[PDB]
Write an enzyme that holds these catalytic residues in place. Structure first.
Site, short mmCIF file in Angstrom:
data_model
loop_
_atom_site.label_atom_id
_atom_site.label_comp_id
_atom_site.label_asym_id
_atom_site.label_seq_id
_atom_site.Cartn_x
_atom_site.Cartn_y
_atom_site.Cartn_z
N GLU A 16 -21.04 27.09 -15.53
CA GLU A 16 -21.42 26.72 -14.15
C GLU A 16 -20.34 26.97 -13.08
OE1 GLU A 16 -24.03 25.78 -12.56
OE2 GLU A 16 -25.49 25.68 -14.17
N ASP B 268 -24.47 29.22 -1.99
CA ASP B 268 -24.54 30.10 -3.16
C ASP B 268 -25.41 31.34 -2.89
OD1 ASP B 268 -27.25 29.62 -3.62
OD2 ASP B 268 -26.94 28.42 -5.47
N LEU C 166 -26.80 20.95 -6.56
CA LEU C 166 -27.56 21.30 -5.36
C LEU C 166 -27.55 20.14 -4.40
CD1 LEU C 166 -29.70 23.26 -3.87
CD2 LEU C 166 -31.41 21.88 -5.00
N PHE D 146 -30.58 22.26 -17.17
CA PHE D 146 -29.59 22.11 -16.12
C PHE D 146 -29.64 23.33 -15.22
CE2 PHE D 146 -25.72 19.73 -14.93
CZ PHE D 146 -25.11 20.64 -14.08
N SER E 293 -40.74 30.34 -27.77
CA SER E 293 -39.36 30.18 -28.19
C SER E 293 -39.11 28.74 -28.56
CB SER E 293 -38.38 30.61 -27.09
OG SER E 293 -38.65 31.92 -26.63
N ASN F 196 -36.72 36.19 -29.12
CA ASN F 196 -37.77 35.86 -28.16
C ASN F 196 -37.16 35.40 -26.83
OD1 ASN F 196 -40.75 35.89 -28.07
ND2 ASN F 196 -40.54 33.72 -27.57
C1 LIG Z 1 -15.86 33.30 -13.01
O1 LIG Z 1 -15.35 34.59 -12.74
C2 LIG Z 1 -14.84 35.29 -13.87
C3 LIG Z 1 -14.31 36.67 -13.44
O2 LIG Z 1 -15.16 37.26 -12.47
C4 LIG Z 1 -15.84 35.39 -15.03
O3 LIG Z 1 -15.16 35.72 -16.22
C5 LIG Z 1 -16.51 34.04 -15.28
O4 LIG Z 1 -17.63 34.24 -16.13
C6 LIG Z 1 -17.00 33.41 -13.98
N1 LIG Z 1 -17.58 32.10 -14.24
C7 LIG Z 1 -18.78 31.69 -13.80
C8 LIG Z 1 -19.21 30.29 -14.21
O5 LIG Z 1 -19.54 32.38 -13.12
#
Ligand SMILES: *[C@@H]1O[C@H](CO)[C@@H](O)[C@H](O)[C@H]1NC(C)=O
Ligand SMILES: *[C@@H]1O[C@H](CO)[C@@H](O)[C@H](O)[C@H]1NC(=O)CCCCCCC(C)C
Ligand SMILES: *[C@H]1O[C@H](CO)[C@@H](O)[C@H](O)[C@@H]1O
Ligand SMILES: [Cl-]
Lengths: 171, 7
Positions: A11, A20, A32, A104, A117, A132
């Site tokens: 998250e 976002d 949110l 979530f 699924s 699936n």
């Molecule tokens: C945060 O950014 C990094 C690099 O772009 C990535 O590895 C990671 O998955 C990201 N985390 C989320 C929760 O989006």
């Protein structure tokens, strides 16, 4: 590890209000605040949630408090749902966390739509479940996350979450 | 810093 740590990997985190990518005002660990396009409305909601004048900034503890409530709320959604509850009940604790994760993310109604699924998971058919689940729009739109969650369903292990490294993109 | 991410 557990659901809390799992969702923290999937998250991310903000201590300040953020618009976002889906056009929602958001904060904490994917909390949110409002669908309204008004930043002031976001602030009003936040201020009411925390019980103080935040100016859009919260502490880690406050983020963690919203997080714990959001996780409980996903569990309640599961237990209230005729399709999700039995499955949840049948599952071991690792696979339960995977299901809380999905709810979530996309809400109980969204997760309850994964009819086949869900059935496969109830029936302990782990590989067919994975295949699936991977057929979904969910998997196309958020693949990095969906792969980890699916793997957790497939193996009943925390392997998809072990030995991951951050790469900046914040701080 | 002080904010999170990831961007
Ligand atoms: C945060 O950014 C990094 C690099 O772009 C990535 O590895 C990671 O998955 C990201 N985390 C989320 C929760 O989006
Ligand atoms: C933040 O990301 C940095 C860059 O990747 C890391 O070096 C650093 O370890 C990360 N720090 C934290 O985890 C700060 C603590 C935030 C904990 C809040 C958790 C609760 C559940 C809201
Ligand atoms: C990282 O960068 C993004 C885009 O500039 C900001 O929205 C965010 O607050 C952080 O500074
Ligand atoms: Cl509720």
């Amino acid at each position: 590890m557990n659901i809390f740590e799992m969702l923290r990997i999937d998250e991310g985190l903000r201590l300040k209000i953020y618009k976002d990518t889906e056009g929602y005002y958001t904060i904490g660990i994917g909390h949110l605040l409002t669908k309204s396009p008004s930043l002031n409305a976001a602030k009003s909601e936040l201020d009411k949630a925390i019980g103080r004048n935040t100016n859009g900034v919260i502490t880690k503890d406050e983020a963690e408090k919203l997080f714990n409530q959001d996780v409980d709320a996903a569990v309640r959604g599961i237990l209230r749902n005729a399709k999700l509850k039995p499955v949840y009940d049948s599952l071991d604790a690792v696979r339960r966390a995977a299901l809380i994760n999905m709810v979530f993310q996309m809400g109980e109604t969204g997760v309850a739509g994964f009819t086949n699924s869900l059935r496969m998971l109830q029936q302990k058919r782990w590989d067919e479940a994975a295949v699936n689940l991977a057929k979904s729009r969910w998997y196309n739109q958020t693949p990095n996350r969906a792969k980890r969650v699916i793997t957790t369903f497939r193996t009943g292990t925390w392997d998809a979450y072990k030995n991951l490294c951050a790469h900046x993109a914040x701080x | 810093x002080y904010x999170x991410x990831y961007x």
